[PDB]
Design a protein around this ligand. Structure first.
Ligand SMILES: [Cl-]
Ligand SMILES: [Cl-]
Ligand SMILES: [Cl-]
Ligand SMILES: [Cu+2]
Ligand SMILES: [Cu+2]
Ligand SMILES: [Cu+2]
Ligand SMILES: [Cu+2]
Ligand SMILES: [Cu+2]
Ligand SMILES: [Cu+2]
Ligand SMILES: [Cu+2]
Ligand SMILES: [Cu+2]
Ligand SMILES: [Cu+2]
Ligand SMILES: [Cu+2]
Ligand SMILES: [Cu+2]
Ligand SMILES: [Cu+2]
Ligand code: NA
Ligand code: NA
Ligand code: NA
Lengths: 279, 279, 279
């Protein structure tokens, strides 16, 4: 980053409301507002050092919770039945998530920071591991930025949940749109029973923390295909159409029967006039 | 590299013919020449910056195509039905693949290069994801070298395709031979329905782009076992017999029922007299 | 490491006895002493450069062997039937494992060292790939330290073997205990038929060789969840309770039906008084 926007230093205390609700079709979703729950749940993005107090309200008729990966939380914000941190029907509970910068410990070793592509989901609906909650749609992305991380034009969330993308019916996307040159960020999460392989036509990224190479010294494999299993999360940024131009670029699971059965979407990269060649 | 051979700078325009054909036993393969199709298809190796024009002819009675991972291609060389870039029976089409070196963008960020271990396969036989084509043998390796990359004595391709290695019958290899000290390159690709774990006796490599460490600063895990799923590709170089001597060194999938059912081969490392201890 | 303990330079010749024995319940385990076999087998830890002569005795009524990952061994210590290096019932055989430091080769390239998290297991019980042996419990961890590697307070071994952790009945752990601040090392190995995803509540590590970052330049993804398949091994160190405090922190496979069916344990992090909040 030299003219691209980059993340500032963190350290703010932030407050926020979340709700779990039952949707009309039988699914379950999180939202920042009652009546506006989505699957996947809304993106939460913070900077290393930020603290997040989430006033969580369960509007459903069964117990539910909020469990996060990667971020610092005390055992009281575990989101599990065992540690008494789930939420009764109609109830409200404040979960606290903290994040930290990396740095030297007293023993001379290097403490990793919280930065990365993470996620949150339910841990008590259906089973004490949230199997029913997760299947129904109680999951969502969390991004933690390091000071200096490159910021994108837009962020899209792709979740392989059992045999669905984002709980959608087979062969219904989702599709995403960009213009040639856009800096597009993808957050890729997997849930459920199955392993998958995420693949994008026409684009590639680094298999490291940020999905991008800092410079010529980073030996990370550059890839366009990645095996994932339940609760894996990673993310990356690509320049839409870079070196390849506009087009209807497929992304899909590359497990042959999964793509055949509907785990396919389109990354629609447009020319400025909005047209897509071959579409 | 200081006395080992290394890749030169790229930037040549290269031309090439390929064919897809039906084989007598019902399989399908690619070749550089009619009558000389193989499974896996022939290796394509280029240097970062090279352009490749492939005059592709489909000699089969069903539509077929050429789809590549990792390399730059415009949407017209997608190799998909949707983007009208497959090929009618008897037809001919010119696919263009480009590659680029890494470098700084105008925004100050670092663009990754095309270098890596990649692959090509069919995308329209049987299904619009090439399920039948891939099952029948329409796949092959592509290597893109960075300026300065270490070159091997020989390159072998190992493809785990469903429950087969290189579409072979159970317990029929393939086997590869080397002499103690040879620099051997492996390109490892997976296709089909199943996850696998690739394992080599007596040898190990780095889990990064090239499979080798540049020096003492590379923190990449050194491994001898790697989980893979459909359309994953990686590669590496080993010094045959280094620190372990000659021998019939097994490689196999480490999923227990897969090795039991025939996903096993031999890396035959010979003494100069050509003998193998214990073989 | 500056006040933390670190590994010394290696290069010692070490001797050791091992036994394979049948256990009263029908399982099979390795031990350093007859009558003290365990599943997992005892940890073997050496420094880069060490040589290890293992006088192995098979006390069982069927042929058995010792096969190691990662370490240097000549073909006579392969532990396979093919290379005549298994052991008859009642027999004794000396296996030799060597290890080496990294360094420059004559050709100018960088030879990787043996350092890493590895493992050993049987290769001839039940099948010529040790399927019965492995299922019955013939597996164990091996750690090879690089000069300067940070040493932990304690090392725990977690093995996902088919649908079990360490061959235990569903929902019986194992559990591990630590005090807030302890440097805890985990060695994580997978065996059998299935892919898994290892997950720890409240803690995270680097996806590289040592599981820790050297400093600010290491671009490795920091994770709390990792997909694994048969014969994969990795390890890492965490500071128990760092930034999160005491508590009954779950670890489990994150494949939903696996956690539901019993692949769960507890990392019990205590305050100095020995108490755990919420437990
Ligand atoms: Cl989205
Ligand atoms: Cl080959
Ligand atoms: Cl243990
Ligand atoms: Cu959990
Ligand atoms: Cu899939
Ligand atoms: Cu593709
Ligand atoms: Cu989770
Ligand atoms: Cu595709
Ligand atoms: Cu396999
Ligand atoms: Cu082995
Ligand atoms: Cu593909
Ligand atoms: Cu083996
Ligand atoms: Cu599992
Ligand atoms: Cu968790
Ligand atoms: Cu093994
Ligand atoms: Na934000
Ligand atoms: Na070439
Ligand atoms: Na020791």
């Amino acid at each position: 980053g030299i003219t691209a926007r980059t993340a500032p230093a963190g350290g703010e205390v932030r407050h926020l409301k979340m709700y779990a609700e039952k949707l009309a079709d039988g699914q379950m979703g999180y939202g920042f507002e009652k009546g506006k729950a989505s699957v996947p749940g809304p993106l939460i993005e913070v900077n290393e050092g930020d603290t997040l107090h989430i006033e969580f309200t369960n509007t459903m008729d069964v117990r539910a919770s909020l469990h996060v990966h990667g971020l610092d939380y005390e055992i009281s914000s575990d989101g599990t039945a065992m540690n008494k941190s789930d939420v009764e029907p109609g109830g409200t509970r404040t979960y606290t998530w903290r994040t930290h910068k990396p740095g030297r410990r007293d023993d001379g070793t290097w403490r990793p920071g919280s930065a990365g592509y993470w996620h949150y989901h339910d841990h008590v609906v259906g089973t004490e591991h949230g199997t029913g909650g997760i299947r129904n749609g109680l999951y969502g992305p969390v991004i933690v930025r390091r000071k200096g991380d490159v910021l994108p034009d837009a962020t899209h969330t792709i979740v392989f949940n059992d045999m669905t993308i984002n709980n959608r019916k087979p062969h219904t996307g989702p599709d995403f749109e960009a213009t040639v040159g856009d800096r597009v960020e993808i957050v890729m999460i997997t849930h459920g029973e199955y392993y998958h392989t995420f693949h994008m036509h026409g684009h590639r990224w680094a298999d490291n923390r940020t999905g991008i190479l800092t410079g010529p010294d980073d030996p990370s494999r550059v890839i366009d295909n990645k095996i994932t299993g339940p609760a894996d999360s990673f993310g990356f940024q690509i320049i839409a159409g870079e070196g390849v131009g506009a087009g209807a670029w497929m992304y899909h699971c590359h497990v042959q029967s999964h793509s055949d059965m509907g785990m396919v979407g389109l990354f629609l990269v447009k020319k400025p006039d909005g047209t897509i060649p071959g579409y």
